[PDB]
């Protein structure tokens, strides 16, 4: 006789984006425009959930807590501080709600029926820091997309 053995488990989600380095480019922006109170065009920040059963992020409770984390503009958890000393900050919108990066729970069910991509939009703007001023120069930032399973 031959006895076959195996085990089956629920796998955690894996993510990916249109870009291999998981980034979105805001292109060039006018220092004066942002300085005057103008904002960048909201960019599509789409995260594809793969290698898992998405029947936990769907819409229509959740066993997977979802949250974003990154340095924030003091006093503004919804403003993701950036690198480059440009004075700019990044804001991310989920599904009618803003994301916070102080490590606060986000909406883990923002999945539109028939899809495995969570949709967000991100805009660049002058920091809300008192006496902040937009300056020429390239900026960048990294946000941690945290999935904590129960």
């Amino acid at each position: 006789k031959v006895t076959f053995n195996n085990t089956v488990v629920d796998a955690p989600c894996s993510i990916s984006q249109k870009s291999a380095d998981q980034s979105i480019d805001f292109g060039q922006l006018s220092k004066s425009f942002l300085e005057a109170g103008g904002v960048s065009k909201p960019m599509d920040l789409d995260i594809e959930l793969v290698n898992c059963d998405i029947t936990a992020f769907k819409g229509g409770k959740g066993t997977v807590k979802l949250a974003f984390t990154g340095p924030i503009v003091n006093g503004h958890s919804d403003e993701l501080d950036t690198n480059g000393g440009t004075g700019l900050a990044i804001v991310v919108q989920g599904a009618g709600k803003n994301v916070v990066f102080d490590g606060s729970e986000g909406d883990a069910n923002t999945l539109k029926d028939g899809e495995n991509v969570l949709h967000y939009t991100a805009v660049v703007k002058k920091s809300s820091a008192v006496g902040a001023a937009v300056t020429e120069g390239a900026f960048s930032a990294v946000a941690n997309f945290n999935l904590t399973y129960q």
Binding site: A11, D21, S23, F139, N144, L147, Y149
Partner: protein, 216 residues
Amino acid sequence: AVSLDRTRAVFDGSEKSMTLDISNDNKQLPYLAQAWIENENQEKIITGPVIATPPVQRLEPGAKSMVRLSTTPDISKLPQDRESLFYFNLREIPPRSEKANVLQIALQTKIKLFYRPAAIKTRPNEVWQDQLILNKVSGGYRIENPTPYYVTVIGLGGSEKQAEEGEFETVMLSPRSEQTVKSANYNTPYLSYINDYGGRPVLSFICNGSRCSVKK
């Protein structure tokens, strides 16, 4: 780009070490994978009793590797008749971007890591969650977990279908502990939980007044 192989990890106390599989699902670029351990309050711990190694590693496109979980002599100071809670973390470091004015996303997977002493070692598809006791109270039920294991409850309704699709607030009971949850009274209570494999079985109760035990 980097992924873990399970949603929870059970560490067999009879073992001194075990491994977890990780993967760089990105076929084009290399990503770094950091791993560390947190205590029950989710605070990072570096000095044991459970250790994660390597703390960081490079993964070439499509590369499969693993993380090792090891114990220190202090592991024996943990209670040996119940489980102890830890958390395992896997977070990637995407390659620095080429473009300027960019925002990058980095995935961090956090899962429960249950230290299971040898004395309570378990068998392949063993069930202990059927020892859960339901006590009806003012506001809902008082879940009682007399077993030496952590039990994650994800549902509680009057039907099997309601236990699963029902809107419930997931709560985890510690070994030998109870807890009250707000809920409507039901004639035939049904409960749903997450087992070692990530499965969500459904338990059917039968009540003898304010007490409800699982139906065998």
